[PDB]
Scaffold this active site. Structure first.
Site, PDB file in Angstrom:
ATOM      1  N   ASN A 186      27.200  41.206  34.192  1.00 47.73           N
ATOM      2  CA  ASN A 186      27.607  41.093  35.601  1.00 47.73           C
ATOM      3  C   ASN A 186      29.102  40.831  35.763  1.00 47.73           C
ATOM      4  O   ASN A 186      29.516  40.380  36.828  1.00 47.73           O
ATOM      5  CB  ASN A 186      26.838  39.990  36.323  1.00 47.73           C
ATOM      6  N   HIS A 188      30.934  38.487  34.668  1.00 49.00           N
ATOM      7  CA  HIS A 188      31.314  37.071  34.739  1.00 49.00           C
ATOM      8  C   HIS A 188      31.579  36.564  33.303  1.00 49.00           C
ATOM      9  O   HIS A 188      30.968  37.082  32.361  1.00 49.00           O
ATOM     10  CB  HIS A 188      30.201  36.209  35.357  1.00 49.00           C
ATOM     11  N   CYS A 223      35.658  30.525  35.520  1.00 50.80           N
ATOM     12  CA  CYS A 223      36.962  31.095  35.225  1.00 50.80           C
ATOM     13  C   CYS A 223      36.811  32.574  35.584  1.00 50.80           C
ATOM     14  O   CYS A 223      35.879  33.227  35.109  1.00 50.80           O
ATOM     15  CB  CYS A 223      37.327  30.916  33.749  1.00 50.80           C
TER      16      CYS A 223
END
Ligand SMILES: Fc1ccccc1NCc1cc[nH]n1
Ligand SMILES: Fc1ccccc1NCc1cc[nH]n1
Lengths: 264, 265
Positions: A186, A188, A223
């Site tokens: 995804n 991330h 982050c």
């Protein structure tokens, strides 16, 4: 892998790979942490889940890691088979807890254990939401009803509040940025990357003379792909360290943790 | 895994992991490249190697990758089983070649293939040398005697000379440094990290709209643990091609050069 006879937990065997081991020819803590998430995903798939979401998909709700606590007694060596059992449990409206037990497939001995705290949040607004009522019922049929804890000792290390590191840090690794291999499907940053970034500020002499026994890590903020991270470490002591990950620019906190190490 | 019936190659099955896949839920090229080195390592262990011999260990000689060439037709999806066959072959006194064939375990179809060129080097002085006859004989009993190539084509991409990228690069990713997860068991940077560093300077729009079909990578110099790397890319081209260069951020010393071919999804 497979769900156990009662269907309330999941087991899976892994053979340790050549590229998965460190300088002492045993699996790194990042390899262990990646195997923990791989068996967690397979547990979810086997019982009909996706973030492991239920009808939370229409509400844009996801499960997010708040805390990860790993304790390793013996790191599996390259070529060894390690068996991991995992299960979830509801902890009221605060969230869910996922636990793991790592064993030696040959001797059957416990070589490690982990526990993690997960909260519900809206994927878009990033606002934390207390676990409703009909979402709770959907998961309960896949969890044991009696408490089953990998860390049973009341008021243990996994439940200890972590303080904020004061400047100046004793050690530091600055300008850490994620690459595409650090992103999940995804896009991330993988939770495992943050563990490696924390361990980057541990001096090489400690890594070379000691073995990591415990790691507790709080996830305060994600982050982004385009973010730059500073890793800070201070010895608080066996050897113990207080850790802090923060954005290189404004110093916004993303993680805080502790590590305990033993002389080899 | 296991050696084949003739003992001249090795096969191994891998189930694709959740953390091993990219945005389109299929195994990344870095995952593929890591599985290639894992089966290579298991082939060596099955026939009594480290991949050095006791003769090579007393002389402090090692095998080093000079070139890696991967071609993927279909990336295995998360949960799929992929079977990989690998074998080595002597290429005279220049070095050895290791090849791979990747298949779908279910259909039996070839979904990819790879070839690598390896040279001998002294561990300490970093000086290359042509293969001695006593070292050659030790490996020959584990390799096919007839040529067996994953890339047999008359005009194949694996043996093309790669040019040096001219400044200014079209795209760049600056300040890339390896972390401890990028080091192997001997504290050297894993060859797979260099592939990821090359791909870092490809714009995200290309990654999102295309799929990597081919990658050829020359390994000129090693990146030390304390070194910082710059990744440079220039489009040279429906298909999209790029010339790539990895160099030390400071003095601009070359460590890698390569090419990638991508096709629209
Ligand atoms: F995936 C499962 C299998 C069995 C019981 C519960 C779940 N999901 C809850 C959850 C939250 C974070 N990880 N898991
Ligand atoms: F490891 C082997 C198994 C069978 C035949 C040869 C070898 N080693 C040669 C080699 C591998 C990679 N680079 N050079």
């Amino acid at each position: 892998g497979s769900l156990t006879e009662d269907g309330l937990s999941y087991k899976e065997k892994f053979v340790v790979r050549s590229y998965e081991v460190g300088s002492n020819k045993t699996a790194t803590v990042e390899t262990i942490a990646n195997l923990l998430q791989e068996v967690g995903c397979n547990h979810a798939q086997s019982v009909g889940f996706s973030a492991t979401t239920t009808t939370m998909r229409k509400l844009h709700l996801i499960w997010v890691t708040a805390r990860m606590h790993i304790e390793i007694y013996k790191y599996p060596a390259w070529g060894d088979v390690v068996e991991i059992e995992t299960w979830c449990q509801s902890e009221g409206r605060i969230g869910t807890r996922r636990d793991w037990i790592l064993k030696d497939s040959v001797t059957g001995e416990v070589t490690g254990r982990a526990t993690s705290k997960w909260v519900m949040m809206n994927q878009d607004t990033r606002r934390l939401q207390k676990v409703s009522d009909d979402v709770r019922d959907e998961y309960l049929v896949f969890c044991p009803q009696e408490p089953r804890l990998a860390f049973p000792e009341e008021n243990n290390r996994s439940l200890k509040k972590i303080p904020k590191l004061e400047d100046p840090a004793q050690y530091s690794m600055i300008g850490l940025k994620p690459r595409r291999a650090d992103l999940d499907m995804n896009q991330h940053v993988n939770n495992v990357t943050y563990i490696g970034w924390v361990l980057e500020s541990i001096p090489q002499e400690i890594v070379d003379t000691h073995e990591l026994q415990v790691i507790t890590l709080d996830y305060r903020r994600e982050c982004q792909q385009d973010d730059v991270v500073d890793s800070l470490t201070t010895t608080t002591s066996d050897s113990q360290f207080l850790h802090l990950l923060r954005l290189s620019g404004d110093g916004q906190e993303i993680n805080r943790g502790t590590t305990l190490w033993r002389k080899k």
